[PDB]
Point group: D5
Chain length 91, copies 10
């Protein structure tokens, strides 16, 4: 799924690619599961959708922390914006 041939990409970029697409897929599930739970009128299916959505959030944040630990840029920008109170554009 690379947009470039593998022989022109370092290993670091290729691993970062693997983490980024994983994070992306998990965030897509978060969106899709919440949509289906809102539209779902069967109580048993609704409880499963929400429960598994929340574990997709956990997987996503697991992957994001792995990226933070190998990316100074992610680390820098995460310290600026995450867990703040002021209007986002003021940080």
């Amino acid at each position: 799924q690379l947009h470039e041939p593998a022989e022109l990409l370092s290993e670091e970029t290729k691993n970062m690619h693997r983490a980024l697409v994983t994070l992306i897929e998990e965030l897509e599930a978060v969106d899709w599961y919440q949509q289906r739970a809102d539209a779902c009128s069967e109580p048993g299916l609704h409880d499963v959708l929400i429960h598994n959505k929340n574990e997709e959030v956990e997987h996503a944040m697991m992957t994001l922390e792995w990226i933070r630990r190998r990316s100074p840029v992610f680390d820098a920008h995460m310290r600026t914006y995450l867990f703040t109170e002021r209007p986002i554009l003021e940080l």
Copy 2:
């Protein structure tokens, strides 16, 4: 883009969807820019791709903070894993 009729989804779900796809697109840019900068053979284009890559990271973390402030599940799991040191699975 939505997978369900809008009138069945809560406004919070629809607004979260908007933010979630924004974060997704910003994370995709982070991956693609790095791949193209790796394969890039001209230094001028390389520096521009890395610089805008890093601002895409900033944009993604801005969106994630907006998600966190309105999503109890994101807040909880972000608290658990982000800015940690132990092996991620131990958390």
Copy 3:
């Protein structure tokens, strides 16, 4: 995503669609995660991928059990083939 206009589908079909695509997306994660784990270079990422892969398997079977309780056709065929021992084709 749906192949027919919602007005012509019963809610049973739409709820089944919701469950079936959820199961499909979970099985896709099981496949893709294993592919990335194998090709992975950094062992830390490999470990995360395997661990969360296995939870996707759990999600999948949770969804499949819901389908079974609502679908007599799934129930019948799951009874015939699941947790058996001899060649699968002999079971038909």
Copy 4:
């Protein structure tokens, strides 16, 4: 379609890929046949669609059993949730 070069994957991974995508396509057909049967008035076509929908369920469970027999993680999770009565979330 694979997401990693074939030379980086074990044969088990690649065989599991072939089983998982087969299962996925079979599950997709179950969904699509049902939607078409609903939106179709001609009883003759409706009947063929249902009869083929049900055979796709069968193909799906055959493939899934093949996966269980070679995947401890599938077996463990299938033993927990499949063929139960209590609320699904109470089984973990």
Copy 5:
């Protein structure tokens, strides 16, 4: 899947659309089931894939027969070319 709004299409057209895409999807399964059968290195899965393939062929011809009974143009061309022995182009 439709390329035109529904209010501009007769009922026979829509039912024909449902039938045609059904045949298409079944023919696609024949193709993919064969490809994966060739590539897989596990005879258990090979035998399942080939067996499911042959059932998809059966579904295909079932749907085609339904089309034939509804479409004179299909009937005529089928009588011309099917179950013959001369080079195909000569049968014009």
Copy 6:
């Protein structure tokens, strides 16, 4: 558009794939042309679409015969279902 690397597919599988995709595309044209003819508000264009539609049916049946001659499974099922009058499910 293949689903497996070429070197793991036999020559016969690939040729069959070429024929099957050809049949699918022709069947797709039958569907799309009918839909366009229905919504067409111009006699000339309507007349052309219906004429080309019927020719695509011929191309389709031409290809299906080529498949039949190289597929015992297609041949067996075509004899069972094509050109009958009993309810399709009653055939076997």
Copy 7:
């Protein structure tokens, strides 16, 4: 599929849309049938594909003529370039 609401388009545009997509699909079939004939091993199949490819060309030019008879811009440009011999850009 249309890229605009049907009510904002004239019937001319919509009928022209139907002609242009038909022409496009026919031209696509021309290309695909030729590619298959080349990579084909069995001679019988090759001739079936060529024969059907040539009929798709005919369908294509049929559709194009219909477009010409109602599009003065197609007619003008078709008169400039079709059935000529000089270098195309010199026209």
Copy 8:
């Protein structure tokens, strides 16, 4: 976007593929530009779309002329149908 591995296609087929997809993309532009022009709520933009639409037609016919000079089947069917006035089917 070839449908067969290039190794199995003659260079004549690949050159025809190049010309055919170019012509397809130009016809797609002719269709889309007219849709956006109709639905346009701004006369200035409408005028640019129509003007450039007509140059897309010109590009299309330039490409089709190259195809005709290179393909006997296109030449023959173009001779039959283009610039006629009786019913297309009667031809």
Copy 9:
């Protein structure tokens, strides 16, 4: 291909969408035509590809000028970066 229903979008946004996708399609043709001219060995086809590529650039810059005239952000950023000499990043 709007990502939101037209009812929730202003007129300026929808017209900007129409101009932006037009610009995108033109830049896409610029890329594709240059690639095909590089790989094409027929002199006649090469000259046509290049000539029409260059007119796609013209169309794109026409569309961009139309956007700049409606968008102070495009205008402000265009003044900062376009027609300059310093290293691109040193321009703020």
Copy 10:
């Protein structure tokens, strides 16, 4: 992503491809952010979307300036149309 083999493409064509796809992706962000900000119902999210939209414009014009410095055709047509006053079609 390329439509031709790389060995046949000059290194300048390939670097132009990388830049053109980046400009395209940035222009798509500009369109999608405006649409989502319009339909947005929360002021805090709206302002974030517009702020980052505007930086996507800045990224697009940075990339475009890089293209202009290495593409005589982009330079020429940009000189003719950008930062003009009279009707656009009168400048050709």
